[PDB]
UniProtKB/Swiss-Prot annotation:
Active-site residues per Swiss-Prot or TrEMBL entry: 35, 52
Gene3D superfamilies (UniProt xref): 1.10.530.10
PROSITE patterns linked to this entry: GLYCOSYL_HYDROL_F22_1, GLYCOSYL_HYDROL_F22_2
Domain spans labelled C-type lysozyme: 1-129
Single GO biological process annotation from the record: killing of cells of another organism
Assembly behavior: Monomer.
Gene encoding the protein: LYZ
Cystine residue pairs: 6-127, 30-115, 64-80, 76-94
Record organism: Gallus gallus (Chicken)
Protein name per its UniProtKB record: Lysozyme C
Keyword Secreted: yes
């Protein structure tokens, strides 16, 4: 599922991401845009062998199990494939755990480099919320 900007904003608000640990809704939509292009089926291998999954590109090294990331962890206690679903509940709840890790949304490199310090409110402008 490739989300519409406002469709995704609506979905994340309903799942309580708006100002979750201080991050206004526009941050999460900005992050999703640059991490996955709003595509729940997005995947990206990275160098250490781990793989990023889903609309928020959650990493298998710590957060989900994909059966091919030796010596990793599964802190969200889920199969990584669950993160690819058209229903973002899995990704959102797992993200909630991540943004609580102590490092905030800096966990997402795309957010740090492309959303942080920008007018993130523009990502939810014009949306019925
Ligand atoms: Cl991540």
């Amino acid at each position: 599922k490739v989300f519409g900007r406002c469709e995704l904003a609506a979905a994340m608000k309903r799942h309580g991401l708006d100002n979750y640990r201080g991050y206004s809704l526009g941050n999460w939509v900005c992050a999703a845009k640059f991490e996955s292009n709003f595509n729940t089926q997005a995947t990206n291998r990275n160098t250490d062998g781990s793989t990023d999954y889903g609309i928020l590109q959650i990493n298998s090294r710590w957060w989900c199990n994909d059966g091919r990331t030796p010596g990793s962890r599964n802190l969200c206690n889920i199969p990584c494939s669950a993160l690819l679903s058209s229903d973002i509940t899995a990704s959102v709840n797992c993200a909630k755990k991540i943004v609580s890790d102590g490092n905030g949304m800096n966990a997402w490199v795309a957010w740090r480099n492309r959303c942080k310090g920008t007018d993130v409110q523009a990502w939810i402008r014009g949306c019925r919320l």
